[PDB]
Design a protein around this ligand. Structure first.
Ligand SMILES: NC(=O)c1ccc[n+]([C@@H]2O[C@H](COP(=O)([O-])OP(=O)(O)OC[C@H]3O[C@@H](n4cnc5c(N)ncnc54)[C@H](OP(=O)(O)O)[C@@H]3O)[C@@H](O)[C@H]2O)c1
Ligand SMILES: NC(=O)c1ccc[n+]([C@@H]2O[C@H](COP(=O)([O-])OP(=O)(O)OC[C@H]3O[C@@H](n4cnc5c(N)ncnc54)[C@H](OP(=O)(O)O)[C@@H]3O)[C@@H](O)[C@H]2O)c1
Ligand SMILES: OC(O)(c1ccccc1)C(F)(F)F
Ligand SMILES: OC(O)(c1ccccc1)C(F)(F)F
Ligand SMILES: [Mg+2]
Ligand SMILES: [Mg+2]
Lengths: 288, 290
């Protein structure tokens, strides 16, 4: 008998199991492919022979596989064994997928939490890891002390199982937006032989300033009123052109700032050049 | 009146620059092309010059913050003699080429010149969190840093090439648009589930702070040209990019951002780089689209 089971031992599942073990929890693990549990076994994990055996070992069963199709493949034969345990699904997917698994679980009397890991594997188990959970509040509250091994930023969103996925994809969008523009900046700076590691601390200090703009612009989005207290969209677009021109002169890719300019051009066509950047929200509300 | 610092250009940003100099006790002369922008500044003790030439003559340090390079040239071209013996600081946005052109103009005339970038909004200027970047002669930066620091404790020197400030500036501003656009898309998506943008924001900001750890790690990989998937493979990324596209389509919101993310990542996939870390995406930014 163990405290927690982890099903799926990819890069992330391995970190999940490792964090549970670091905090002293008796942990059972299983993976479809043999040979991914070596380090975990040395740390004290129990290697279950089968997914069914693994599920039977613990009152809390955590799944972290590639996608919804994998989740269904692992879970579909475990409907009997999972009854009366709490199943926690940390696999990425859509709100629709999460609601489908929630319906599957409810038909079978399995209490279900659907979560999103807002961390990389190396940050799991530390104070900086953040994780979001949706489903029954009482099940979250009953298992939170154990789930908190995965990160101090463990947080409950609400009863609708799909919420975790909705927040997750919205947040992941920000990751790509920030990383892609960082990489474009590094490519541009690399033409002047500025190393990416030289640029990074400037990028990160600036990103910290940008979080203040996020908070201010969020208030403006909630009002539907976008005064240019800092800078007008017209002022922004003049600098977008500088980025385009600088990139062209350096011979690097310009797809990112070209899309920025295209989207801002729609606001300008709507007469919003004199408003603050938060007015751009109107360009994201509907398809082009 | 003899003053410590002159500000030419009293837009939203110029007003904040002049205000910060005044807050720190510096005698400040101001000028703007259009009359009537300086009322609040005058009440704070700014001296309102009648002309740009009079303003430039009042101080040993002259700061310009106008719309663009064309405006800078319009203001400065007649001041080549007046600027003799003074240090000119240009905080106007522009390209590295424009900065080097103004630097050449200044050098022909013996005007010591610093080219800077304001990595802050007007309300943050004059606080400890404001970040500003300067390029040009190190000795001139060192001589005027105590006064320049009135604009922000994050005042920093980049190097001797005057164009560096602009190169860093546009690279950094790209990050601002990338982050803000994706935040606004996320807010639009969450709004369909009745989540307010102000509810989402603290989650976005906590996550953005985690992403800075990825920036630092990936930068090291960029400098090595080696991109092992220590966290997640590009294949794993693209599966979540599709979730974002599908979620956005189901919610009826715009999908242009994640579609471009997918397009760019598909180029890495076509090159066989699905099993590498996301830092390998640097190769998609090095050259024009084919
Ligand atoms: N890595 C990260 O930074 C990170 C961060 C946040 C969220 N996540 C999410 O966490 C999940 C796992 O990612 P990862 O990085 O651990 O991926 P990974 O290294 O690709 O692991 C995928 C896992 O899914 C299993 N799997 C795939 N298809 C299966 C099937 N048909 N039946 C049973 N098991 C199957 C794999 O088993 P085999 O070993 O047998 O192939 C493996 O355990 C993904 O949803 C991902 O988006 C990852
Ligand atoms: N606002 C921000 O958050 C921010 C942040 C960082 C950097 N910046 C940069 O700071 C600079 C100023 O931005 P801002 O927000 O202050 O813009 P702004 O409010 O639009 O001000 C533009 C300024 O330039 C002057 N100007 C324009 N053309 C001129 C010319 N031919 N001759 C003389 N003066 C001229 C204007 O004078 P009039 O009043 O007579 O038109 C005004 O003082 C821009 O390069 C901008 O990108 C701004
Ligand atoms: O790019 C900008 O619009 C900007 C806004 C906010 C903070 C820094 C820069 C500007 F054009 F004003 F520089
Ligand atoms: O979106 C992801 O690639 C990811 C990577 C790093 C941190 C969070 C999420 C994943 F697909 F893995 F979820
Ligand atoms: Mg070269
Ligand atoms: Mg090397």
């Amino acid at each position: 008998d163990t405290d927690v089971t982890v099903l799926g031992l990819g890069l992330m599942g391995q970190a999940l199991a490792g964090a549970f073990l670091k905090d002293g929890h008796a942990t059972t693990v299983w993976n479809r492919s043999e040979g991914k549990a070596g380090q975990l076994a040395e740390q004290g994990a129990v290697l279950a022979s089968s997914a069914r055996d693994a599920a039977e070992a613990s009152p809390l069963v955590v799944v972290c596989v590639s996608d919804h199709a994998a989740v269904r493949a692992v879970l579909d034969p475990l409907g009997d064994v999972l009854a009366g345990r709490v199943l926690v699904n940390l696999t990425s997917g859509t709100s629709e997928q999460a609601r489908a698994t929630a319906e599957w679980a409810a038909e079978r009397g399995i209490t279900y939490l659907d979560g999103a890991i807002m961390a990389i594997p190396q940050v799991v188990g530390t104070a900086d890891a953040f994780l979001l959970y949706s489903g029954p509040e009482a099940a979250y509250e009953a298992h939170e002390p154990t789930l908190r091994s995965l990160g101090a930023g463990t947080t409950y969103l609400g009863a609708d199982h799909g919420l975790s996925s909705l927040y997750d994809v919205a947040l992941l969008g920000i990751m790509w937006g920030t990383l892609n523009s960082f990489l474009h900046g590094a490519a541009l700076l690399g033409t002047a032989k500025v190393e990416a590691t030289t640029f990074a601390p400037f990028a990160n200090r600036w990103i910290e300033a940008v979080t203040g703009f996020v908070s201010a612009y969020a208030g403006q989005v909630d009002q539907g009123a976008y005064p240019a207290l800092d800078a007008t969209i017209d002022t922004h677009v003049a600098t977008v052109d500088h980025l385009i021109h600088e990139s062209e002169a350096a011979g690097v890719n310009t797809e990112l700032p070209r899309l920025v300019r295209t989207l801002a051009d729609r606001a300008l066509a709507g007469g919003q050049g004199g408003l603050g950047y938060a007015a751009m929200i109107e360009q994201f509300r509907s398809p082009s």
